[PDB]
Symmetry: D2
Subunit: 396 residues, 4 copies
């Protein structure tokens, strides 16, 4: 974006605003445009726009002035060519898949894929004849193999993963894929464009869930997809049809929340790391998952491709479904709810929160244990948070 | 909804508010809830919810207090069992189709189908092996024939139609379809739940584009699908995956706009009718399309299943692409833009506005003429509008 | 404003938007500008603005792009030279008084003055030595007398009045006051800029409470003051110091609500009138107050300076505090609350609602009877409303 | 507030929300309540509320659910008994002055008082016979003298001061005042409830300007007044008449902004201090103002009653009106505008920005030099900022 703006924090603030907005004003902030359509002065100009000689969104489903600002902002952060914003993260992945993978094509992902996204790939895509290969996050051989057996169209995965924060060597993975013509998409939701530049490491596309860290206030939903124009534009087209447009009000709520992205992330990164160690050393804590820890499987990877390790920390308590529940019920600061990344701390038992519909055996079939607890550290003072977590574990 | 409320106008105002809200308040209006998730007091309760013993949206993608109000509101008007709201009309149709029509299945629609909706059906659905039969809005024999030849899954169409406002005998069409097991979905955007009750006439589902008349202020987009629970719920499920959630801020903007629905519709209904006749009798106007006119192909049907004929009026000027434009360029009150149904009057040349990408020949291939002009009468004073249209016509 | 615009309805919609906004956009609606300050490109320009060579609001407390629109909009309706918008109606009257009336000066108002306003004039102004003469709305002799005895600075009153909707011959009163140099300010809240033009009748300043009819949806508070520049500017200056600025989000909610002012007012005007007569003829109704009725004291004046008679109707039930309450408690459509002018209907007993702090004797000291009931007719269907009122009247 | 939260940061986040809201929900954030009035179920209950047996706001001008949350939140931070929120900072001071000081009373303030506030005290208050004594911020003897000569009603001042960030020994000043029965009001705007607790130091009332640091995003205006109930309630009463109510939307924007108050403040405190030194050592900088420096007149006081020194830094460049301007015109990150405290950095020449109307002689008569430059450090990265300031300093 700007030369005088070299830090990501400065970018997250003035990116797409300080130098101009396209919607002129002497105001410091971006104006919210609540319009469903855009007019033209005369039929002559309408034709001009229709003939690529003029610029206009024409209709609200094809864009919005207050929305593009956030599109450019995130684009600068990720250092992408273009960024597309949708109603939600799910909408982003969904549309992207439906737009890039052709019928009958093949897809490759990890076993730790977000549940809902797994369902979409195992129940909807097959309808278009799309087949998929599910490998382990670390199993690079499996990827290389599948890369040769069938013709892979695109390798999709998130890093860190949910809920075990498993990381993928983006640089490597990308190289293997591009070697066989496969595409690579990374869901850096947990990471944040501040803790890692998936695009700079080789990924073709990087999508986020503004609902989490980008918004950071737990009050709005949004989808994010950044990458090269040639690509992002293909998705944008299908988007203009499926109509999963983001409301201008929401767009501003995110622009606003991003003004303090770096500040929030910085604090969440510490509290998370510091509390992880404390938890790891705790006698009542059986296992702790965090890329920052030395005990993490891909700790060497995370350390090589990340500058931070996120504010999300998962760990298994030394008890059972009931005891573990007793622990979370004891906390007093975090909310017992889904989602994560907001100023307010949140806790939940993935076993109950997102897999209660399955049987204990089917649950265990995929790592989720009644022991697993996912803590999303807010922005509250460390001491207050630490004391709370400890006070809770005591009752166990 | 209420017994003391026997009129749609009264309903559109208090339906889903006067009796209760689920979100208690001594406030007259519905509170906007800007949240991404919902918390639980204790693991115990969380389980209860998961075991269908307690109620909660859990996550913002699965619902919202300020959104269900609008959902119940619209459900009362259409006299439906349940209503689902999306980010936009296109999202509504799109999701509904992907959810109800199975792979390899067959679909039936009209030739006047909304352009973008046509594209989705002719380029995306085929990927799932879904084939379609396109018939003329009036050709009931074609429908009956198709109903017997191939196994029709669902008959989709809008009524009135765009831009020639063609109408379908909903009652009849429903009968034929249901006889063969087909589903019927009517797009009553142009109509409005006030001018007709597609659900009462026999349709299974009725969808709208709150972006138009329901909102009425040209400042927000939204999708609408009302129908039986068994059906609408199936859609809601795929919706929870595709993630086309509607923002609470937008949901309120619609709730508010609907408070004056009946009043707006009433006025537009008149302005349109009166202006249509005046236009028809005008020497410079070659043809006029409006269900309210006796010259309309299905005026008899419109008169039998409608109480109003919308505020949209299409007509052909006595000139060419250039002359017609000169007419619209002379208008001073309406805006030259897409969309319709807002308090502000709008005008456009479908030919240019939504078919400029096609050749003159390919355009004529489907009724669109450089002569056609679609007028969306706002809520301005009739005399002011009439005088403007006349003064303008006085130039061609 | 516009030449092609000759009807208030059309004006209330496009006034201050259709021709230009000062904040350029190809958007149909007015954009919301959420800013606390406005920047300058270079010290040179800042100086220009300070030297009155350039335009700018500088600070949010001094103006806002999305607010002026509303200022100009209302200015057109009242045909005023300039309009000022504040936080609330009380804010407007308050600031206006403090600004125009000098210390030790004298004021003249009616006995039916709005309570709160009465308190301000009887407890605050005296601190600045400002004395006041209170006369009866109709007593023109008293006004003329006071006009000669003391040196009146400004005559302030509302018309219709609350809650007895008393009217004042603006034309006459204005004439008498201007003869002695006194200023005249009318509070046309109940009337609405559609039902009467106080400015055209001779008044110097006309103020409203957008909170009521202008907003029309019972979801925002705002003040209104329209009149000559020389005058309104003087108020604006004190405003910039007392800081009762109006939030941009609020300004838009009103701009939006006004797009259907004429439509709403039209409907309320009828329902009110019709329901007034029905009520008058009812055996259980002792008295009914409404300028539209022939039994109203200033019906001849109302009939001469108004085109409508508002949507507010006051009447006394044939019972007591307890009985009358039983009546309002029987209603099902209207809300038991203060305020009026919104789409939703509202009822209340001034006695209890705004005079419960006074003794029965002190209450009757100024017309308020435990009998009095103020009905604010919403926009719901007449039949639904009528049936409701009549039904609850069969339980007395 | 809470016993498990002892840090201000955690307080600024959950204060007034984590334990309850008064407006029940399972939502994590506070709901925005857009309503002008509040209803009652039956006349019986209406009476209960009027007789202090039930709770209700009755009318929007008297309170709002989404507003009180902010009232209680700031109350916790300041450790006050109650907080009142208005439309703007000016409103707060103005109303607090008109409510606490009686007619003919005496007031005491400093020479560095906020300009607009000075005007109000020097032009409006005298109309009520209220006289004032202006002393120098440091001059304690003057205060002690004035405290004995005339009968001081209230001593009002800010600390730090604008623009020379002069500080006042709150503890001391409080003692002398209370000894003679005077009241003490501190405008801790520049300080922020995080850097100092004027209330705990002895102040009777501490008022802010949420428009600055509290909101921290330069997109909303708001006034703050915290202190004991007996006192704050007296103001709230006059407030209910002057009608400077705060819009719920604005209230939410602050509640949200305060979620990252500590984070923002923390960063701004550093940058400012660090840059303050570098600037002081700079050869082109003649003088620097900042309570954090050892060169500041009341650095010993600042150090004893503050934990931070604000993000505002004033300094004089080695040049003239024209040269100084050249420097600000060279900057690229901060905006040239009024206000301060937001994420975005801002700069201005008080001489031009707020004193251009006065003569060079009249300006200097009160310290304002054509040299003075007030820098409001945003939240951008220090390095980026530092480099910018330096770069524009070499242009000189
Ligand atoms: C948040 C999230 C999503 C989906 O985001 P929505 O906002 O719910 O649409 C998908 N994947 C991961 C890994 C997430 O954390
Ligand atoms: C407006 C409209 C749609 C699509 O609405 P969106 O709000 O753009 O999704 C579909 N069909 C018809 C007939 C419409 O008029
Ligand atoms: C509504 C009203 C006011 C004050 O309006 P607010 O919105 O409460 O500030 C003053 N006078 C009359 C006659 C009103 O009806
Ligand atoms: C910002 C400020 C005020 C007034 O704030 P407004 O938002 O302009 O009302 C008063 N005093 C000081 C010292 C301020 O910094
Ligand atoms: O708890 C979760 O796993 C989660 N994470 C992110 C977004 C939403 C959720 C909730 P779920 O999938 O159970 O519907
Ligand atoms: O102009 C139209 O046909 C129209 N109508 C309704 C909604 C949106 C549009 C614009 P588009 O060309 O992109 O289809
Ligand atoms: O009921 C009323 O008198 C009324 N009217 C208009 C606005 C507000 C009110 C309520 P209050 O008693 O507080 O003055
Ligand atoms: O620049 C200022 O002095 C300032 N400070 C705080 C709030 C507002 C301002 C702008 P003004 O010139 O009008 O006083």
């Amino acid at each position: 974006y700007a030369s005088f703006l070299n830090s990501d924090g400065s970018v997250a603030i003035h990116a797409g605003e300080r130098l101009g907005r396209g919607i002129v004003t002497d105001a410091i902030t971006t104006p919210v445009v609540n319009t469903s359509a855009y007019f033209f002065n005369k039929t002559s100009e309408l034709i001009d726009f229709k003939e690529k000689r003029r610029a206009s969104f024409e209709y609200g489903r094809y864009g919005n002035p207050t929305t593009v600002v956030l599109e450019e902002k995130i684009s600068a952060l990720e250092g992408a060519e273009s960024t597309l914003l949708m109603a939600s993260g799910m909408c982003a992945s969904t549309v992207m898949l439906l737009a890039l993978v052709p019928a009958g094509g093949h897809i490759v992902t990890t076993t730790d894929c977000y549940r809902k996204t797994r369902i979409f790939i195992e129940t909807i895509l097959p309808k278009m004849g799309i087949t998929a290969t599910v490998i382990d996050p670390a199993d690079v051989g499996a990827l290389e193999l599948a890369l040769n057996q069938k013709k892979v169209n695109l390798f999709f995965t998130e890093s860190p993963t949910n809920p075990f924060l498993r990381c993928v060597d983006i640089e490597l993975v990308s190289k293997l894929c591009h070697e066989k013509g496969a595409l690579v998409c990374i869901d850096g939701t947990f990471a944040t464009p501040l803790n890692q530049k998936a695009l700079a490491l080789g990924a073709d596309l990087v999508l986020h869930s503004a609902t989490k860290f980008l918004g950071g206030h737990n009050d709005v939903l949004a989808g994010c997809i950044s990458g090269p124009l040639k690509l992002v534009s293909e998705i944008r087209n299908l988007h203009h049809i499926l109509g999963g447009a983001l409301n201008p009000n929401a767009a501003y709520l995110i622009i606003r929340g991003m003004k303090t992205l770096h500040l929030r992330v910085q604090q969440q990164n510490s509290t998370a790391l510091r509390m992880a160690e404390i938890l790891e050393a705790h006698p009542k804590v059986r296992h702790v998952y965090y890329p920052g820890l030395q005990s993490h499987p891909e700790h060497h990877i995370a350390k090589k491709q990340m500058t931070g390790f996120g504010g999300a920390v998962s760990f298994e308590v030394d008890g059972d479904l009931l005891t573990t529940a007793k622990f979370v019920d004891a906390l007093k600061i975090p909310y017992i709810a889904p989602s994560f990344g907001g100023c307010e701390s949140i806790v939940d038992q993935p076993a109950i929160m997102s897999y209660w519909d399955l049987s204990q055996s089917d649950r265990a079939k995929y790592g989720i244990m009644d022991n697993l607890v996912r803590f999303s550290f807010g922005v509250e003072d460390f001491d207050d948070l630490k004391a709370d977590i400890l006070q809770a574990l005591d009752s166990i």
